[PDB]
Design a protein around this ligand. Structure first.
Ligand SMILES: CCCCCCCCSC[C@H](NC(=O)CC[C@H](N)C(=O)O)C(=O)NCC(=O)O
Lengths: 209, 209
């Protein structure tokens, strides 16, 4: 049976899980919901068989999941990409939590009203952050070496969002600015980004500042 | 040698990790900073050997980690308590994300300003969230059934800090209210709480409204 991921019609926390699936050339079908359809959601929210009703959600035969990460860490984990050995396993978890610090650092205020004023406070911490990746991919093709892991999209995402809040901000980081290319290079992702699927704007909710 | 886990002198994201440890009777020694000691932190912040400098951190021979989860998922992992199978691995990653949804619902508000302007707006959809557990802890002893996993503790604290703001809250949720006891009903855990190692408060931090 074909798996069923589900989430609004934005990028939010699903965007990365899309590419992880896109890059694995996996077959799956999307179940979206648009800015008003909040009803049909509040409708099936408890009709699907999810222990913890929430969006996004993933359903194949075996499981019925809800919790963005537990859903990518599954798809990935299915195809041994998680690392078979504590250290290496914690090593992605460390690359996970980080990419979501740069990723949540927008989401927070992205809603928290008066954006302009706050953005800055944040944008001046983004460097101690973005930095660490410039000096990671400094002698590594992708975050975790030779092969593509799953954080290697979570970040590609974080970036893909920031060049929208201050397009320059990457520059001092060639490795990163280049990074974003090496990814969009991966044929499978190409197929996608120039597809009819690909959901362009928005990055947050149809509310967000 | 003896492992080092470091954080500020509060509970924040470490509290859980400490119990996971405490529960496993594991040996480890603390390294905590106070509300003023920010310097000494900003000091060794890059002298340790951490690929991604941040608080808290965990160091023990093989790995030097940052990222709160990556840490706990490591201690745990290192004892098999993470489930050796995809489904049962994502199951715990489902619980994880959801216990954090309660804690991350009291820390972008408590960092906002006068919390009284961003309190209940979430204390709104806190129920469905709490509820979902009331219902998971229906037939099961621990969030995962027969044996203690790591999201348990997580929860245990999530809840612990929740009583704080407005005691009553856990009422229509006796399975829960009951739960907490079942936890601090574990010998080992009981051995901490009463002791001179458990940090009283602030459970949150020193910038709590
Ligand atoms: C944890 C705070 C983050 C808040 C911002 C979330 C932005 C994405 S839009 C989806 C939103 N819920 C979630 O994303 C669930 C959070 C969960 N942490 C996850 O990672 O999946 C919702 O309105 N779901 C429909 C509903 O159940 O009301």
């Amino acid at each position: 049976m074909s798996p069923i991921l589900g989430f609004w019609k934005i990028k939010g926390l699903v965007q990365p899980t899309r590419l992880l699936l896109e890059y694995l050339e996996e077959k799956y079908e999307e179940h979206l919901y648009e800015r008003d359809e909040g009803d049909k959601w509040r409708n099936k929210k408890f009709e699907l068989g999810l222990e913890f009703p929430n969006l996004p959600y993933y359903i194949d035969g075996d499981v019925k999941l809800t919790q963005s990460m537990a859903i990518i860490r599954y798809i990935a984990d299915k195809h041994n990409m998680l690392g078979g050995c504590p250290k290496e396993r914690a090593e992605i978890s460390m690359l996970e939590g980080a990419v979501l610090d740069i990723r949540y650092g927008v989401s927070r205020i992205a809603y928290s009203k008066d954006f302009e004023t706050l953005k800055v406070d944040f944008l001046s911490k983004l460097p101690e952050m973005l930095k660490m990746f410039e000096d990671r991919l400094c002698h590594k093709t992708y975050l975790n070496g030779d092969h593509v892991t799953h954080p290697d999209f979570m970040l590609y995402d974080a970036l893909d969002v920031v060049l929208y809040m201050d397009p320059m901000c990457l520059d001092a980081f060639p490795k990163l600015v280049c990074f974003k290319k090496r990814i969009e290079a991966i044929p499978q992702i190409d197929k996608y980004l120039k597809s009819s699927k690909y959901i362009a704007w928005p990055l947050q909710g149809w509310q967000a500042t």
